Write a protein that binds this DNA or RNA. Structure first.
Ligand SMILES: [Mg+2]
Ligand SMILES: [Mg+2]
Ligand SMILES: [Mg+2]
Ligand SMILES: [Mg+2]
Ligand SMILES: [Mg+2]
Ligand SMILES: [Mg+2]
Ligand SMILES: [Mg+2]
Ligand SMILES: [Mg+2]
Ligand SMILES: [Mg+2]
Ligand SMILES: [Mg+2]
Ligand SMILES: [Mg+2]
Ligand SMILES: [Mg+2]
Ligand SMILES: [Mg+2]
Ligand SMILES: [Mg+2]
Ligand SMILES: [Mg+2]
Ligand SMILES: [Mg+2]
Ligand SMILES: [Mg+2]
Ligand SMILES: [Mg+2]
Ligand SMILES: [Mg+2]
Ligand SMILES: [Mg+2]
Ligand SMILES: [Mg+2]
Ligand SMILES: [Mg+2]
Ligand SMILES: [Mg+2]
Ligand SMILES: [Mg+2]
Ligand SMILES: [Mg+2]
Ligand SMILES: [Mg+2]
Ligand SMILES: [Mn+2]
Ligand SMILES: [Mn+2]
Ligand SMILES: [Mn+2]
Ligand SMILES: [Mn+2]
Ligand SMILES: [Mn+2]
Ligand SMILES: [Mn+2]
Ligand SMILES: [Mn+2]
Ligand SMILES: [Mn+2]
Ligand SMILES: [Mn+2]
Ligand SMILES: [Mn+2]
Ligand SMILES: [Mn+2]
Ligand SMILES: [Mn+2]
Ligand SMILES: [Mn+2]
Ligand SMILES: [Mn+2]
Ligand SMILES: [Mn+2]
Ligand SMILES: [Mn+2]
Ligand SMILES: [Mn+2]
Ligand SMILES: [Mn+2]
Ligand SMILES: [Mn+2]
Ligand SMILES: [Mn+2]
Ligand SMILES: [Mn+2]
Lengths: 36, 215, 145, 157
RNA sequence: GGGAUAAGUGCUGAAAGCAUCUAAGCAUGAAGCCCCCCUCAAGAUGAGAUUUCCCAACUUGGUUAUAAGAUCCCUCAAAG
RNA sequence: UUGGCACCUCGAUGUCGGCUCAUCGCAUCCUGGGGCUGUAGUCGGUCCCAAGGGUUGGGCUGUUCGCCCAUUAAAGCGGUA
RNA sequence: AUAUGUUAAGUGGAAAAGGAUGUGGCGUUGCCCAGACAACUAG
């Protein structure tokens, strides 16, 4: 997961969710994941 | 798991089947007898108390430790043994095989058995830092007035004490040391001697406790 | 110096009580017991002497925590050796030796003065449900409020 | 079939086996029930919806259990045993031990075709998550333990 | 070797008919965290345990020698 | 770090570099665990966890730096007057 | 202590641009049993 302060969906397949108390991207593309 | 007490007699060479030259320490274990069975029942934990070398007479009315005192008399007499001069526990024995009155004998250690050996470590006196922690000396020459002193002992005004770890001069020789993994090389049942591969920490005549290796 | 009772060692009696931690919050059982221990509960309270009663806290194991702190509340300790801090223990204290979790926790609510010290030595905490001290014949006591 | 025990809403299914916790503090309905959408009060609606979901997932597999299938897309493939699948998988230089009898878990052997064969989807999902854990689907020549019907993206050497 | 964990990988899962490692609940996972390994350690005043040893004369609580047991002193060293 | 300010010390708070001894932080040089990869393999890049331990001998210069010779798994960065 | 609500971060008990279906209130609106959101079947 790219680890960044900002979190937005990357592409129109992406979905945002909290998972440990942390907001995270779920784009399904292996090189498009995120977790603030 | 097994163990015996023994007096370190000293070092020799001995020869392997391959001509291999194996340094050996000669441990001697005449006369060890089990003296007490320590069960969880009474003692709270499991141990066999073995009494090493034999010592004199009775509550005989005299100066030395060589002669046993009434407390020892009664302790040995509960075990139908003559009074002994060294006594130690081994926890981590088989605690059930071992009935109280019996001898342990050298024959319990079989050749090629790998073992750990405890014993207190020779004895240097009050000693300087270079001898006791190996610390490099200061330069000689080049105008130095520093040779065998332990270094800076601390910080400036921040660590404004000397930290509790600090290492400096004093007594060297105490401290029990055990050394791990040494082969039994031979066992000489005729004189109760038992040969140990390598060197065990004693001075000489030091009591050492051999026990079955852990790990 | 008109009138003002001060309790002597002649003029004072010390009762024994048993407390069931099972079902209680750590801090609340702790503070209630501390006042019990200081005698701050009798009308004959007097500051320069140990006026308190004995407390045996029971089933220390069943003590509880409020927050998400079975894991989040660490106890530290330092060995006075360099870098020998010891973070260890959380509500792991309640797992092994909770007798100390309750003991030290209660004792941190008594004054650090030799009197307060003797006062702390009047507590007895057992994780199990069976004190040795039956001979002192403790009365069962219910947590107020 | 339609047989299940009850007490304190922690009751075993009568067929085969069960035992499970409830979150308690919730509205409950007999047989199939419903209302995954809302119940009781507040945003505890989520929790109760998970309760109905869990018990429903429980009853759904007790008569006809669901079983994940795992295919070994490589030149090596696991054999079989009465308590293990004997995963001599991929080409790591040793066979691995695996499997457990907990609840009910069947073996499988079909030349690179294996299956967990449990009851509830949680135990199956677990033992197969780990049966598939031993080697992974490396996305080139697609090799590796693979859940059946899994997307397996690839790329160019 | 065992236990718990991080980043991570997940399972089951609603909120949010789907989907989702997570909020309930589960599994996995590091030279690191705990136990294991080595030495110290009951002045742990919270002063622990086991085995053995000794055992009265006087008393207006105590008194005094003694016992088990040591030590002083003396010959010493593996100790200093 | 270079500074700004002039609050402690002018009836004195020794000062660069080295040497001796270290101790701590993590923004990790190596080693352990992973994600992405424009990751085939062998290597690597980059981020994430991790501070247990380790982290070299010389040529020139007072030097700290720096260049260089030769090795290393690596030749980490800072605090502690 | 009382009454009514909030907060689940030990926030309380250090910090910004920026970021998030975290929850609470107060409003305004467009599609809704003429069937809509979502899911599944047909280009
Ligand atoms: Mg970052
Ligand atoms: Mg996690
Ligand atoms: Mg000398
Ligand atoms: Mg709790
Ligand atoms: Mg205990
Ligand atoms: Mg103080
Ligand atoms: Mg567990
Ligand atoms: Mg003492
Ligand atoms: Mg006492
Ligand atoms: Mg003592
Ligand atoms: Mg003399
Ligand atoms: Mg030094
Ligand atoms: Mg970086
Ligand atoms: Mg480190
Ligand atoms: Mg160290
Ligand atoms: Mg160099
Ligand atoms: Mg070179
Ligand atoms: Mg490498
Ligand atoms: Mg350098
Ligand atoms: Mg440094
Ligand atoms: Mg604070
Ligand atoms: Mg600004
Ligand atoms: Mg803010
Ligand atoms: Mg809002
Ligand atoms: Mg709102
Ligand atoms: Mg309107
Ligand atoms: Mn040197
Ligand atoms: Mn001088
Ligand atoms: Mn000199
Ligand atoms: Mn100085
Ligand atoms: Mn584990
Ligand atoms: Mn679902
Ligand atoms: Mn004692
Ligand atoms: Mn009398
Ligand atoms: Mn005598
Ligand atoms: Mn001699
Ligand atoms: Mn400055
Ligand atoms: Mn000034
Ligand atoms: Mn001014
Ligand atoms: Mn002065
Ligand atoms: Mn001065
Ligand atoms: Mn870090
Ligand atoms: Mn790595
Ligand atoms: Mn370091
Ligand atoms: Mn309220
Ligand atoms: Mn805070
Ligand atoms: Mn903002």
């Amino acid at each position: 997961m790219k680890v960044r302060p900002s979190v937005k969906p990357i592409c129109e397949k992406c979905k945002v969710i909290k998972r440990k108390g942390k907001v995270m991207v779920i784009c399904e593309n292996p090189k498009h994941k995120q977790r603030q | 798991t097994k163990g015996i007490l023994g007096r370190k007699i000293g070092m020799t060479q001995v020869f392997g089947e391959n001509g291999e030259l194996i340094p050996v320490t000669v441990v001697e274990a005449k006369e060890n007898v089990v003296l007490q069975k320590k069960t969880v029942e009474v003692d709270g934990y499991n141990a066999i108390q073995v009494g090493f070398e034999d010592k004199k007479a009775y509550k005989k009315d005299a100066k030395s430790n060589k002669y046993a005192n009434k407390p020892a008399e009664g302790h040995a007499k509960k075990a139908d043994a003559a009074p002994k001069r060294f006594i130690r526990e081994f926890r981590n024995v088989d605690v059930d095989a071992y009935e109280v009155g019996q001898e342990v004998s050298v024959d319990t250690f079989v050749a090629g058995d790998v073992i750990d050996v405890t014993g207190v470590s020779k004895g240097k006196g009050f000693q300087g830092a270079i001898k006791r922690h190996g610390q490099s000396r200061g330069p000689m020459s080049h105008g130095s007035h520093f040779h065998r002193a332990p270094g800076s002992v601390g910080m400036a005004s921040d660590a404004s004490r000397v930290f509790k770890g600090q290492k400096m001069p004093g007594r060297m020789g105490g401290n029990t040391v055990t050394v791990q993994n040494l082969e039994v090389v031979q066992v000489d049942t005729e004189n109760k001697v038992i040969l140990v591969k390598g060197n065990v920490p004693g001075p000489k005549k030091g009591l050492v406790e051999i026990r079955t290796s852990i790990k | 110096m008109r009138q003002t009772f001060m309790a002597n060692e002649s003029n004072i009696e010390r009762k024994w009580y048993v407390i069931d931690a099972e079902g209680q919050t750590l801090g609340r059982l702790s503070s209630e017991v501390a006042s019990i221990l200081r005698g701050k509960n009798k009308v004959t309270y007097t500051p320069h002497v140990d006026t308190g009663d004995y407390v045996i806290v029971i089933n220390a194991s069943k003590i509880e925590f409020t927050g998400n702190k079975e894991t989040d509340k660490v106890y530290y300790r330092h060995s006075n050796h360099p870098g020998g801090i010891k973070s260890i223990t959380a509500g792991e204290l309640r797992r092994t030796n909770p007798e100390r979790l309750i003991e030290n926790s209660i004792k941190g609510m008594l004054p650090s003065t030799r009197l307060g010290e003797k006062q702390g030595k009047k507590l007895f905490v057992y994780g199990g449900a069976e004190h040795p001290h039956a001979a002192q014949q403790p009365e069962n006591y219910e947590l107020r409020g | 079939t339609f047989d299940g025990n009850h007490v304190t809403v922690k009751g075993p299914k009568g067929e085969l086996s069960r035992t499970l916790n409830e979150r308690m503090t919730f509205k409950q309905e007999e047989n199939t029930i419903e209302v995954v959408r809302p119940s009781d009060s507040k945003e505890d609606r989520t929790n109760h919806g998970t309760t109905r979901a869990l018990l429903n997932n429980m009853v759904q597999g007790v008569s006809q259990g669901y079983v994940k299938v795992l295919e070994l897309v490589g030149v090596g493939y696991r054999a079989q045993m009465q308590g293990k699948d004997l995963i001599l998988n991929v080409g790591y230089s040793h066979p691995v031990e695996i499997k457990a009898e907990e609840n009910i878990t069947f073996s499988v052997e079909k030349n690179t075709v294996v299956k967990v064969e449990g009851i509830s989807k949680e135990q199956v999902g677990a033992l197969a998550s780990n049966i598939r854990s031993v080697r992974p689907p490396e996305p080139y020549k697609g090799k590796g333990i693979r859940y059946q019907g899994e997307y397996v993206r690839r790329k160019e050497k």
